[PDB]
Amino acid sequence: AGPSAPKLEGQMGEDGNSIKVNLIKQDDGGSPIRHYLVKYRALASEWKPEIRLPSGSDHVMLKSLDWNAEYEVYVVAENQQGKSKAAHFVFRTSAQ
């Protein structure tokens, strides 16, 4: 039970490996949502030191990743009355 997994919109910075993951909400039940659990990995190493967002954020970010590499970002959310499944955002970095 609980909210539905967030929708992750991808904004890539012209730096080549600067990634902003925007967390769009849709169904929670009056938005009783609490922060996000964000963990991501690349096509080289898995699960990097994950991060927990503030209690009610808008996005999560990662900077200075491997060039010409693929990345997987998994974002879970918490809610007053339980947890909300993980949504998966996938992208690739630019070339150095």
Total structural domains within the chain: 1
Cβ-Cβ contacts under 8 Å for 54 (sequence gap 6 or more):
35
The parent domain of residue 90 ranges over 1-96
61 phi/psi in degrees, rounded to 5: -140, 155
CB 16 within 8 A of CB 96: yes
For 60, the token pair is 């999560």
Residue with tokens 């959310």: 77
Q: How far apart are CA 96 and CA 80, in angstroms?
A: 43
For 82, the token pair is 């339980």
Cβ-Cβ contacts under 8 Å for 18 (sequence gap 6 or more):
12, 61, 63, 64
CATH code, domain with 87: 2.60.40.10
3-state DSSP call for residue 46?
A: coil
Q: How far apart are CA 48 and CA 95, in angstroms?
A: 21
Q: How far apart are CA 54 and CA 81, in angstroms?
A: 18
CA nearest to 8, candidates 68, 67, 91, 92: 91
